[PDB]
Amino acid sequence: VCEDLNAHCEMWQQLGHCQYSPKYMGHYCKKACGLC
């Protein structure tokens, strides 16, 4: 299914890592990113 892979996913998405670096968030954080 789709789920965060890193425990810091929220820590990175809350900083905009998905808005800024979605290339590695989509591969680690799905919900935190626009994947779920």
Side-chain angles (χ1 to χ4, degrees):
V1 311
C2 64
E3 73 188 352
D4 60 11
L5 296 177
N6 201 64
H8 300 160
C9 273
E10 186 184 1
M11 298 302 297
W12 303 336
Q13 84 83 34
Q14 80 194 214
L15 297 179
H17 282 217
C18 267
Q19 187 194 47
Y20 307 135
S21 190
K23 305 293 187 257
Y24 306 78
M25 293 297 286
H27 185 90
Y28 276 87
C29 321
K30 328 303 285 305
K31 289 153 91 303
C33 243
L35 309 195
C36 249

